[PDB]
Symmetry: D2
Subunit: 313 residues, 4 copies
C-alpha cells in the first residue's frame, strides 16, 4: 500500500494526464486504414488497483485494438496452460538484440522472446492445439474476459482483414519459422498466422485493459471478481519479459528510467503494471520513432518521478 489515500493519488493522475496532453508530437500509424483513421488527439488513462478501486480520465471508453499489447497476454495464457519449461522449448527469454538486429531467429533457431513478432507467432501456435481456429479464438476471448473482469473485449474485423492482407513481413516470418521447424509437429502455419492476425485485432478500452493489467499486478487474481485467472508462474514470467522486451528498442531506456513492466502497441496503447499496486492502460495514437505512444511514454516517466514507483526506488 504505497497509496495511503486513493483520492489524492487520483488527483495526481489527472495532473500527469493534463501534462502529457500538451505533448503533441508523433505520428499515428498508417500502414493500414483502420489505424490511420484515428485522431491524434485521443488520449485516455485508466487505473485499476489491486484493491479494485478505479479511476479514468480522457478518452477511456473508445475501443482500440490491442495489437502488440496482446503478446504478453497470450504468452501468459500459454505458460498458464503448458508451464514455463514447455513454452520456452519453442521461444527464448533473451531481451537483447544480442547480435540479431532484425533477425527472425537466434543462433539456436528460436525466436528471441515472446515480445517480438516471430516469438508471438510461435506462442500462438502452442495455444489450445488440436482444435479449429474458431475454437482457439473463443478460448482466448473467454480468457481475456476473465482477465478484464468481464469488461469490454471486442473484435475488429476490418483490422483483421487489412492486417492479413498487408502483413507480408509476418508471412515471411511464418515461412522462415516453418523452414527451421519452429512450430510443434503438425502445425498449419498459414492457419496460425490468421489466428495471430485475429489476436492483434481484439479490441479493448482503457478501462477494460487497465483491469487486465491490474490482474497481472495482482498475482494473477482479477481485482474486481477475485477469481484466479493466471498461475503465479505465468504472471511472474510475463512481467519479467515485459520489463525487458515490452517497449521495442526503447526497452532499455524505459527499464532504466521507468523500471516498470509494460507493453506497447502500434494503436498507441501502453499496458503498464505496478506490481502489487495497480494496473494501467494509457492510450494515444501518435507514436514516436520507436513505435511507442508519445503521450504514453511522457506519462510513464512523470508517473515514476512523482510517485516513486520504479522497481528499485
Amino acid at each position: 500500500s504505497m497509496i495511503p489515500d486513493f483520492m489524492s493519488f487520483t488527483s495526481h493522475i489527472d495532473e500527469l494526464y493534463e501534462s502529457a496532453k500538451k505533448q503533441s508530437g508523433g505520428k499515428v500509424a498508417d500502414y493500414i486504414p483502420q489505424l490511420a483513421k484515428f485522431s491524434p488527439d485521443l488520449w485516455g488513462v485508466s487505473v485499476c488497483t489491486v484493491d479494485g478501486q478505479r479511476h479514468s480520465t480522457g478518452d477511456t471508453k473508445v475501443p482500440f485494438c490491442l495489437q502488440s499489447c496482446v503478446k504478453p497476454l497470450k504468452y501468459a495464457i500459454a505458460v498458464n496452460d503448458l508451464g514455463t519449461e514447455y513454452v520456452h522449448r519453442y521461444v527464448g527469454k533473451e531481451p537483447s538484440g544480442l547480435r540479431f538486429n532484425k533477425l527472425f531467429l537466434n543462433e539456436d533457431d528460436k525466436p528471441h522472446n515472446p515480445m517480438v513478432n516471430a516469438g508471438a507467432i510461435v506462442v500462438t501456435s502452442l495455444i489450445k492445439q488440436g482444435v479449429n481456429n474458431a475454437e482457439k479464438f473463443d478460448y482466448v476471448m473467454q480468457f481475456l474476459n476473465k482477465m478484464a473482469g468481464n469488461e469490454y473485449v471486442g473484435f475488429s474485423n476490418a483490422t483483421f482483414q487489412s492486417e492479413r492482407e498487408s502483413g507480408d513481413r509476418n508471412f515471411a516470418i511464418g515461412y522462415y519459422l516453418k523452414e527451421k521447424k519452429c512450430f510443434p509437429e503438425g502445425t498449419d502455419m498459414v492457419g496460425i498466422l490468421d489466428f495471430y492476425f485475429q489476436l492483434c485485432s481484439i479490441e479493448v478500452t482503457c478501462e477494460s485493459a487497465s483491469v487486465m493489467a491490474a490482474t497481472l499486478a495482482n498475482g494473477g487474481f482479477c481485482p474486481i471478481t477475485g477469481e484466479r485467472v493466471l498461475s503465479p508462474e505465468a504472471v511472474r514470467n510475463t512481467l519479467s519479459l515485459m520489463h525487458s522486451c515490452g517497449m521495442y528498442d526503447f526497452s532499455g531506456q524505459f527499464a532504466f528510467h521507468v523500471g516498470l513492466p509494460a507493453k506497447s502497441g502500434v494503436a498507441g496503447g501502453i499496458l503498464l503494471v505496478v506490481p502489487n499496486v495497480m494496473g494501467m492502460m494509457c492510450w494515444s495514437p501518435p507514436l514516436d520513432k520507436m513505435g511507442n505512444s508519445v503521450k504514453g511514454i511522457h506519462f510513464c516517466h512523470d508517473l515514476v518521478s512523482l510517485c516513486n514507483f520504479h522497481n528499485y526506488d
Copy 2:
C-alpha cells in the same frame, strides 16, 4: 520484512549453501597466476540485512579480488558525485548486445553500459578528475570502506601487476576509446588503465562485500553504521544496470529465473542484492562458460525458488 524470523532464514541459508557445495563443475580462471592459485573448493556465503543482522557460512574470511564486481560500485560513485545526466553523456544504459557482439562501442561511439570493460574504463576516467592516480585510488578506497562499514577492504599488488602486464584486450579498448574521443577532455588514457587495473585488484571477503551489497539494498545507507554513503539516484541506477547487465551473457536467463540485481567477477564472486531486504556475497573460484561462479549461480537460483525473492514474485 519478508523475513519474519532471521534465525530460521539463517538455517535455510546453510541448507542452500550445503546443496550448492555438491556442485563441483566449472574452471578456476587462469589467465593470470594470481587467479589460477585458488582452490576450486573454496566456497562461502555472507548475508547482511537492511537491519544489520549478519550470517556467514563457509570460507567467508578469505580475501579475493573484486575484479568485475567493482564495476557497479565505481559506477555508483561516479553517479553519486556527478549525477545521472553527466555520467551517461559518456556511457550507455543498454543491456542488450543489440547488434554489437563484442564491439567496444555502440553506433553512437559510446560504450554500451557501465557493466562491460569499455564502459568501466570510461567510468573510471570520470571519477575525481584533475588529481593524481594515487589520490584517486585513495578516494575510492575510502568510499568502499564506508560502503563496507569499515570491514575488510584490501589490495592485491600481484594481481594488479599481472592484470596490467597481460591485459592486451583492455589496452586495445583504451586506444579505441581514445580514437573516438570517448574520454573527458585532457584524459591520460594509459594512466586511466592503471587506475582501472588497480580497482579490479581491490580485495574483499564475503563478509565485507556482503555489507557493501547491503548498503545498495538499503537505499544507499550502510546497515551497520547508519551513514548515507550513496545518493538514492546512484543506488537506483546501479541496481537497474546490475539487473540487466551484471551477469555477462547470462544476464537474460538470470533476470528471468532469479530476478535480482547482481554482478559477477572472474575471481568467482557474485555481489547479490535483494532490495530492501539484504545484501549478499557468494564466492567460489570455479567459473562456468559464461564466466559466472558455478556454485554461486546454483545458490542464487535455489535462494529465489525457496524464499520467493524474485522481483516479480
Copy 3:
C-alpha cells in the same frame, strides 16, 4: 590460343579427370528425393572451346538440373534484354557478405547480387514482364537452346514439384521482397516463385552445358553455330559476378586459387568459364560443406595449376 595442340590438352583433361575421380568425400544433396536419388560416383567433364572443338570424359550424357547454375544464365538474359542500368536498379553487384550474413537484403533493401537466391528471385521478376508464366518459360528455354547450340536442354517436373513444395525459405524470401517493394510494379510474387522453381528445374548434360559456358567464354557468340546470343555487356557483367559470387561462401578461396568465373549448383554441377579459351561443365553429385561439388572443386584447382589458366597467371 593458350592451347597450341587440342589433342594433347585433351590428354591432360583425362588425367585431371582421373585424378579427381579418387576424391570420394562429400554428401549428395538430399533435401528433396529427386536430388537424393543420384549416385555419388557419377562424374563427368565436358569441354567446348571458343573454336567449337569438343571433348568429354565420364558421365557426360546423364541429365541433371542446373539449379543455381541457372542464376548467371538468367541474369545474362535480363541484362541482354534490359541493360545493366535497369537490372541493377533492383539488384546489387556486391560479392561480399559485407555485414549481411544470411540477410535477404542489403541496407538499401536490395538483394546483394544476382548469385544468391533473393537476387535470383528478383532477376526472375524482370524477364519478359507482362506475359503469362508459360510464355516466360518458353522464352528462356529458347534462349538456353541458343546458348547451347541446340544441344540437350530439358525439364524436370518432379524436381519442380518438390522444390516448390519444400521451398519454405524461398517463400520467406519472396514475402520479404514484397514487403520492401523489391519487385517491379504489378508483380505477382507467388507466380514469380513458380517461375523461379521451374528455372532451377531445367535439365542439361555436361555436354550441352559446356557449350553454354563456351558461349560466355566467346563474348556471347555460340561456338558451334556462330550466332550472337548475348550482348557483350551481358557477358562481361555475368562473368564479373560469377568470379566474385558464383561459388557460395567459397568464392573468396576459389577466386584466389583458381581465378576463373564459375557457378556451382546443388545438383553437383560447376559451370566453368576460361575467357577467350573455352567453356566447361564439371558434374559430380557429392557436395562439400560449402555446397560445391567435391570432385569439381578438386578438378578446378588442378586444371589451373597445370595449365596456368588463372586470370592473373
Copy 4:
C-alpha cells in the same frame, strides 16, 4: 599487345586526363597536417608499359606518400620471401566484409586480408624477422628501388611522426592482434607498428610508382631493367587481392565496372595494373566518401570504357 600504336594511346591518355581534371569534388585527407597541406588541384597520371615505354601528364614529379598503396607491395615481398602457404597462415584471403564490418579479425582470429590495416600490420611482422627495424626498413627500400627500376623512392619523416602520434586506431589493432596471438612467436608489437608507420610514409612520384605497377603487370620483371624482382606466385596473389580488396568498400563496384587490379591510398594515389599491358599511377589528393581519389576513380572508369581493358572484355 592491345596497344598497336603507343603514340595514339598516349594521345587518348591525355584526353582522359583532361576529362578527369574537370572533376573537382572530394576532400583532401586532413587527419594529419602532412596530408592536409596538399593542394586539391594536384593531378597526375604516369604510364609504364610491359615494354618499358613511358608517358606522363600533369603533376607526375611531385612526391607523395604511398600510404595504403604500400600494402600490396609489402604483401608481395612477404610471399616472395616466405611463400603463399606460410603468409596465409597469419592472414586471410577473403575480400568480403563477410559479416565482419569493422572488425579487426575474422572468426578464425585472423585479419580478413592483406589489404586492410590489421592485415597489413600482420604482414609487416612477417618480413625479415630477427633483424632490427632499421635493417628491415632498408631491406624493403631496396626492394622498392628494384620494383621502380631505381626511380624516385623517398621517405617522409614528418608523416611518419604524425602517423604514429595520432594512430590510436592502429595501436588498438596492434594490442588486439597481440591478445589473439596473431603475430609470429617473439614479435615486438610496438616495434612492428613503427615499421608499419614508416612503410606508409615512403614517398614516390607518379612516374616511379607507375614503374612499380608495371613490374606487377609484367609477371614480376621490372620493365626498365629486365630484372626479376618478385616471384610469379607473389605477383599472382597480389593481383588477385588487389582486384577484390584494393579499393576499400568500393572494391565491389570497382571490380564490376573497371575490372582491374588496383590499390588506393589516403594521399590520393591509385596504383593501377593492366596485366601484361602496363602499370599506372594516378594521383589527386581529393578523396571521396570511400577514401578513393575522385579524379582517379573517374579516370579509371573512363580508361576501361574507352580502351576495353576490363578483365572480362
